[PDB]
């Protein structure tokens, strides 16, 4: 199907505790494949998926160089934004950035992304045209003018339409046995009496990849969106994910309830019920 590559940068100041830390991680879909941490004894871009290990030393040296440069540039950027918001030198602050590209099944660019945040709030984003910026406030307007003078949008459009798509296609091929393999969930329904009046039906999905999944409870065929408790999808640690959905049903009415599971790994969507 469709695929994505995303990089996630976190830069954190910590006054009185050294210079700001810079971390970068890269993902293809829901698979992390590289990391960098400026706090490491010897900071290097490092592999986190087997299929990236085959890249040569020039690859690792170049990505390390970019990340070491970024460590310094984000320290400057944190100093700049502290000034733009008239903030004291005593507080800790965070800049985050996420960027990358989505491609269709034919490998063609669906869209590109580049968004930055300051202390968890939207700060500046590259618009979908890959040519203009949306600045959140008058501080971000300063960054926008700097980036316009540096022709940043033009350079990101070149990256997003070129290298980002080309490297994503290379990774998808080199890791095809995992990145292009959808593992369906293992499913079951459990029954948890609450009282003599009510019980909990919990529909489980385990071992699936990628994380995208739809779990829903129906009562007599009608969706129970407002009444269904959905837990946040969680990583199992072996690349796969887990999720459950729960609904409180009147005792004796359990057969009116069906759990519906949609996932890319499944031959067809599943309908499940409690089987006492």
């Amino acid at each position: 199907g469709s695929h994505s590559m995303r990089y996630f940068y976190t830069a954190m100041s910590r006054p009185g505790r050294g210079e700001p830390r810079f971390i970068a991680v890269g993902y293809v879909d829901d698979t992390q494949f590289v990391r960098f941490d400026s706090d490491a004894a010897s900071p290097r871009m490092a592999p986190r998926a087997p299929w990236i290990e085959q890249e040569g030393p020039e690859y690792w040296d170049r990505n390390t160089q970019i990340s070491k440069t970024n460590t310094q540039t984000y320290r400057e950027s944190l100093r700049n934004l502290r000034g733009y918001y008239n903030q004291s030198e005593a507080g800790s602050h965070i800049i985050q950035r996420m960027y990358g590209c989505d491609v269709g099944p034919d490998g063609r660019l669906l869209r590109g992304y580049d968004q930055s945040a300051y202390d968890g709030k939207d700060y500046i984003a590259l618009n979908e045209d890959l040519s203009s910026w949306t600045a959140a406030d008058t501080a971000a307007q300063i960054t926008q003018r700097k980036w316009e003078a540096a022709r940043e949008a033009e350079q990101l459009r070149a990256y997003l339409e070129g290298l980002c798509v080309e490297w994503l296609r290379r990774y998808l091929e080199n890791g095809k046995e995992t990145l292009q393999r959808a593992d369906p969930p293992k499913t079951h329904v459990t029954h948890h009496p609450i009282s003599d009046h009510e019980a909990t039906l919990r529909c489980w999905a385990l071992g699936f990849y990628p994380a995208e999944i739809t779990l829903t409870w129906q009562r007599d065929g009608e969706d129970q969106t407002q009444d269904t408790e959905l837990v946040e999808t969680r990583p199992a640690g072996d690349r796969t994910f887990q999720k459950w959905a729960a609904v409180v049903v009147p005792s004796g009415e359990e057969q009116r309830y069906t759990c519906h599971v949609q996932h890319e790994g499944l031959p067809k969507p599943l309908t499940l019920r409690w089987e006492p």
Binding site: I66, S67, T143, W147, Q155
Partner: peptide, 9 residues
């Protein structure tokens, strides 16, 4: 592959 290092904010 990372994007090249860009301009400070």
């Amino acid at each position: 592959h990372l994007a090249s290092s860009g301009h400070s904010l």
